[PDB]
Amino acid sequence: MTPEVAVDLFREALWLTTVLVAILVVPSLLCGLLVAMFQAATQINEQTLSFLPRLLVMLVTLIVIGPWLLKIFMEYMLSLYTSIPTLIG
Amino acid sequence: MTPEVAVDLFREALWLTTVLVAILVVPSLLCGLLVAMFQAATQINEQTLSFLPRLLVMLVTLIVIGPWLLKIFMEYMLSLYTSIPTLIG
Amino acid sequence: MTPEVAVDLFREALWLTTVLVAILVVPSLLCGLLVAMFQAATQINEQTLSFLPRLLVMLVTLIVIGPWLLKIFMEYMLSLYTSIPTLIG
Amino acid sequence: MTPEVAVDLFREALWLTTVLVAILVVPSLLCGLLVAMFQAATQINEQTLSFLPRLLVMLVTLIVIGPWLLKIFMEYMLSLYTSIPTLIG
Amino acid sequence: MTPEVAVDLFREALWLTTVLVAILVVPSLLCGLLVLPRLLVMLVTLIVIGPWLLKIFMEYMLSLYTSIPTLIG
Amino acid sequence: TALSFIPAFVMLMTSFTRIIIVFSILRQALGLQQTPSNQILTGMALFLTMFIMAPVFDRVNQDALQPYLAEKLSAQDAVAKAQVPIKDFMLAQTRTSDLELFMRLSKRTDIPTPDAAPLTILVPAFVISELKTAFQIGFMIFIPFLIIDLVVASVLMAMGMMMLSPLIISLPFKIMLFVLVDGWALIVGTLAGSFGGV
Amino acid sequence: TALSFIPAFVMLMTSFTRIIIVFSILRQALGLQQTPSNQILTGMALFLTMFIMAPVFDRVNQDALQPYLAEKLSAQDAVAKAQVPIKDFMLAQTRTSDLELFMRLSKRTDIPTPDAAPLTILVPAFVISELKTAFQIGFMIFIPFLIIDLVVASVLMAMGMMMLSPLIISLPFKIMLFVLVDGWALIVGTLAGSFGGV
Amino acid sequence: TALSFIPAFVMLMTSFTRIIIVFSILRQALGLQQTPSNQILTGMALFLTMFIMAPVFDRVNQDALQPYLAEKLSAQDAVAKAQVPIKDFMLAQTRTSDLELFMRLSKRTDIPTPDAAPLTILVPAFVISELKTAFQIGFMIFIPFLIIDLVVASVLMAMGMMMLSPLIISLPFKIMLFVLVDGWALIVGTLAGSFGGV
Amino acid sequence: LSFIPAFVMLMTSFTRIIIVFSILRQALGLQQTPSNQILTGMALFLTMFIMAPVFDRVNQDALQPYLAEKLSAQDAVAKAQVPIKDFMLAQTRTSDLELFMRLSKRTDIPTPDAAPLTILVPAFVISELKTAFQIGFMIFIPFLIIDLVVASVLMAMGMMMLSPLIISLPFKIMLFVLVDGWALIVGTLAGSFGGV
Amino acid sequence: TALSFIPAFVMLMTSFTRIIIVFSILRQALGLQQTPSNQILTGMALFLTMFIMAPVFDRVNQDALQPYLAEKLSAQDAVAKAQVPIKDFMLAQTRTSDLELFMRLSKRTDIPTPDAAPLTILVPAFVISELKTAFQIGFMIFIPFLIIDLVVASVLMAMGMMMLSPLIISLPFKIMLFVLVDGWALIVGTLAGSFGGV
Amino acid sequence: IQISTWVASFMLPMFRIVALLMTMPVIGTTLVPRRVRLYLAFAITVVVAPALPAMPPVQALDLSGLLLIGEQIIIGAGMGLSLQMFFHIFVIAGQIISTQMGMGFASMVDPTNGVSSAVIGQFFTMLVTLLFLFMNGHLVVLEVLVESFTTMPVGGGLLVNNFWELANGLGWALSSGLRLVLPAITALLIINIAFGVMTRAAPQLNIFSIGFPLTLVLGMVILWMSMGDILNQYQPIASQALQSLRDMVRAR
């Protein structure tokens, strides 16, 4: 196993992590920007009508995405655990 | 146990979580919007007459909701813990 | 111990908590509303002459209330810890 | 040790805290009110010429007060730590 | 420590904090008095001050440490 | 193997598990602090267990050890005669639901007497009832510290003073409130009273 | 080799692994608390083992011990006659996929009967199947406490009140919910019921 | 075995329980810092305990071990002759309420002697009084650090400077104030004075 | 007493197996109490199952003829050393062997290991730790992905101080159940070990 | 007791304690980052301790081990001949106030020499003066990091940048200002200089 | 038995190599059970025991071989720590990045999870363990230790009073850590400040709401980008650390 292979593996891991985090988070970030809209229209300097919609949209995004995110992760894990005995040597 | 079943379970969990959070929080969010009303009528740029009513309404909402939220959760937990030996296999 | 009893206990706890928080906080909130008065009379868009009086009044309220709040809490705790062996069964 | 004694101790603590906070903060609050003067004379709706003088005056107040505030606190601490073995019982 | 010494060190540190924050923020204050600009003035100030402020802080940190053994007692 | 077995025995067949767990909850319920160290908590629970089992150990020494300082018998019926007192004692505190559930899951044969013919079916029912009661007590003794935590956090936020970690400010109020109501005598009396019939 | 003998053979070939793992997933699933000490947990798992291995040990004492109080044989075929019950018991619970996998990885000779001639190929099969089932049960019992955690944290944040460590406020709600649904008899009956064919 | 026995007997009947706990409160009371390691706190409290137990251990050595370098007796009355001084010592500090509570919960017989005829009922009362008093002391020595914390947080919030986490700022202030008032000689003095009769 | 279990950990499969299982116990949710006493037993049973051919050959060449009072404490022990010797040789990487021949500085043996076996055992265990950490981090990576997704979602929820390990534990368990988890890992161990 | 013997007997009578406490304060004083890991902090502090005890251990070897390579004496006076140099070294750094305090709290008899004839009254005095000096150094080295925290937070709130947690910004600034000033040569030189008489 | 006379003769290099293995970052990180490590060191010592002198401690000075064992344990632990700070370079780099992303709000309490290091610190530690193992690294150390028994072998031992060097150790570690993440750190800083301008430009931008999701989305990307260069940045550091070991033992 070459350091090149270790970099391969960590590029898999980190790209999967960043795409999962984007997929899960960006809608919550957008709803945060939209409650920022709302608080900027009328000068509502508030602290939590910006958190509640973000959490609701995060949980809705988890529920919606759900199975196919789980499938992506499952066969990433399956790729890793089937290729282990080859990349060992 | 199929990945389909795991998605079933997590859909139960996440829908229960989001409905509990909405039920508990939305009145506090509304009282926050109403103190935002009050601070927008007269230019009261304040920081905590927006927190105190929200906490009072949250605790009142907990006290009022109380038993039937606890019952919903109890028989959700009972459903899970009675179905475990079947969904095992 | 019935779920009804658990709701009894949490109604004790939450009503005690909300009355303690009101007793401790409402004078600070009122002094915040009064510095809001002051900042609304002359257009003093300031950020901390609204915090200092609120903290001073909160500490003065703690000092004044003090012993009898502590007594209320002490015999609430005493009620709970004397009734435990009965409400067990 | 009686609950009365605990209230004694916390009255010491809270009065010392509020007098320390007033001594340290009130000059900064006054310089904030004075930059509020300045921003009210000419319509300078600014955000930080109100912070810089307040910080400068706070640090100058710390430097000036300094030793005698430290002495007050030192012999408050010394009173507490010499009276502990008596107020134990 | 003989608290007088502790007050001395704390006065030194507070005066240094005052000096640094003043040097950094007063130019932005003046440019805000004249009028995104203030951030640009902060950047210009950072770059134009550069090595000598870090060097004075380095001298002070070095002095603190090199003095610790004697200030202990 | 006996060396590893004995402490599990002294825990499961005696009061220990109800006490330590409660104490554990207290160490969480009380100020966030760790290090009452669960080594003086373990010793204190052991001492409370000795103090509560004093009648049970008294009856055991009466029926088993009092005649067996004279080389009467070994590894035989006397062990059963010593099992009888602790068996009846454990029966005194197992909830009926747990015994019903374990007789149902054993399915061997119905026994007319309430005592289960094997100790090995009675002990887990006793332990389940013990954990249930211990969590009941621990939650009850938790509630007021939760009240203090919510009060302090709400006051801190109400002074606009976010990010002060209300647990660090609440630890002394928790300790004071737990010494003014006498705190430990209350809980130890509750444990030792709810355990037996007074 | 006795220390590698007892806890390796009889704590893996019997129900101990899934019970102890489920109890640990509980102790963590339950409020963050430690000190159920994994010692009363090890003991409770051992007694649940004795309670569940009751028919298996009954059959063992039937086919092996009952005639061998009379000095019949020693270190011979009676050991295989004692392996038969535990072997078919283990077979009753190893998933088909697992036995397929280990017969494939052994490659020796296709044994006609489902259990391969030796035990050293069935025990790893049993242990892997037991770990899969134990993680299934542990995750299943974890879900609702995760729900309480998320709800409590969300309510603390929605009160504008962060930095309050929602786990310390969730510990009593977790204990309360785990006592009201009766908690421990549910999980113990689930273990002993999903374990065998009812 | 020995690790099970030594801590209980030698660190719950002695002063250790009061000292270490107080020190732990210190480690919390002081700046948020961990790692005075509770391994130099344990050794330091152990030295303070051997230093307070000096008269007690002197009298035990005189009453038991001084005549028993000459092979006089073993595992008999000498043990009670050694129990008497530690018993009187523990009685000197056990609050009256706790002795009354435990005499009430034991119900055996009214024993007029102030020392509890069994050490097994006097030791738990002593440990409860020890916990109550150690929490009293630790809370006392906590108060001024709470003062410093509140002052720092109020100054920061008064500079409009939120989220600078007044605790990390307060840590060196707490250390400075705890050195200028001599800090450790003070607290060692309070412990060794409040523990004994001066 | 501990001489006999020693030569079993070093020479047999036990090392990389127990190491991969320790990685797992750490790779999985922070949980302890798979107790390393059922992990030791599970790894020892996997060692028996994997050494089945090796121990079969040992019994063939050594114990089959030595139920008959043939010989004791002599060359038969080397006849038993031969099979385990070539087995270990099959898995020690070339680099470790080169290095230990270099460190011994003895008579040149580029052909298989020195007969005392004293300079193949440590090379085997070194290559063993190397491969075990390989597989360990290989199976550790996806659990790291889960940890990072959980922590980043929680922080992106503004919901800090929730200790994302306590929320990541059930997702780790769920993912380790769905991909079937344990059969994958045990098959990987027992397949990457020998030639398939 | 050999595992408890090492820290208490050796790690307490040496430089370790103030070094490890200053290192912990540093790890906290430094950017909020943990994991200099207190596993290489302990090794690093132990090697500093060895470098600083070099003359002390040289004297010990001179007067104890150099004649005792030759089977001279066992477990007798030579131990005191080796106690002498470490005792004088410990006196060199114990404050007069703490020695006075412990001579007052012992009340045994005025020892003529300034050194405490028993060691067990000099070691805790050494440890208390040690903790006092360690917290002194800790506050000192914390000062500039507090300065940077304050400056960065002032600028951050001065740009209306709320909720950016100026500690998250100050960590790189902290480590940069800690590396440019060379950081560790400084602190380790301060420890090694303050410890000895130069 | 009646044979255990020469196997316990040396008994010293066993202690040296054990001390190295216990304090090494990979062999001795509690993922390896202590039985494996102890018997591994026993095997390495029956390999290397030829071609080295002994200096027997046999029986004199009620226990003097204990002084000598202390000497060797010190030397071996020094080796281990000297190459442990090497891995802590990357540990510290990863954790600076993790904190700046916003995964360190466990600092200013210490009731908490802690500054989560399993998330990133374990990540970079796995990186480095793999890379280190694939280089001759894990091997060269052993070679190094062999030469140890020829530079400061046994007897008086000539232990050293050089500890100062590795006591100054962590310094360059911190330094090295910076030079690994400087292109990342700065980026993150800019992002923060960048987001700050938003908050300054448009008020009521609560950036527990918007600041940290953005910072984490971009911090994962920045991690992935720096992981490209990580190897060319790593290569000189391992060389310098192994030369540090080389001169630590070979000198004196």
Numbering used by the authors:
A (entry chain G), B (entry chain H), C (entry chain I), D (entry chain J): 1 to 89
E (entry chain K): 1 to 35, 52 to 89
F (entry chain C), G (entry chain B), H (entry chain D), J (entry chain E): 53 to 250
I (entry chain A): 55 to 250
K (entry chain F): 10 to 261
Show sentences the authors wrote.
Type-three secretion system (T3SS) are multi-megadalton protein complexes that are capable of bridging from the bacterial cytoplasm to the extracellular space. At the core of the secretion system is the highly conserved export apparatus (EA), which is made up of five predicted transmembrane (TM) proteins (SctR, SctS, SctT, SctU and SctV in the vT3SS; FliP, FliQ, FliR, FlhB and FlhA in the fT3SS). Here we present the structure of the TM region of FlhB bound to the FliPQR complex, in addition to the structures of the FliPQR complex from Vibrio mimicus and Pseudomonas savastanoi.
To further analyse the structural conservation and stoichiometry of the EA core FliPQR, we chose the homologous complexes from the fT3SS of two other bacterial species for structural studies: the V. mimicus polar flagellum FliPQR complex, which has a longer FliP sequence including an N-terminal domain conserved in the Vibrionales order, and the P. savastanoi FliPQR complex, which is a mixture of FliP5Q5R1 and FliP5Q4R1 complexes by native mass spectrometry. We determined the structures of both complexes using single-particle cryo-electron microscopy (cryo-EM) analysis to 4.1 Å and 3.5 Å, respectively. Both structures are highly similar to S. typhimurium FliPQR9 (root-mean-square deviation (RMSD) = 1.6 Å over all chains) and S. flexneri SctRST (V. mimicus FliPQR and SctRST RMSD = 1.9 Å and P. savastanoi FliPQR and SctRST RMSD = 2.3 Å). Furthermore, our native mass spectrometry had also demonstrated that a small proportion of the P. savastanoi FliPQR complex contained five copies of FliQ, with the predicted fifth FliQ-binding site beginning to encroach on the predicted FlhB interaction site. Consistent with our previous native mass spectrometry data, the structure of P. savastanoi revealed an additional FliQ subunit in the complex. In the P. savastanoi structure, FliQ5 binds the remaining FliP subunit in the same way as in the other FliP–FliQ units. In fact, the hairpin composed of FlhB helices 1 and 2 is bound to the site occupied by FliQ5 in our P. savastanoi FliPQR structure, packing on FliP5, whereas helices 3 and 4 pack on FliR. Thus, the presence of FliQ5 would block binding of FlhB, suggesting that the fifth FliQ binds to the complex in a non-native manner due to the absence of FlhB in the overexpression system.
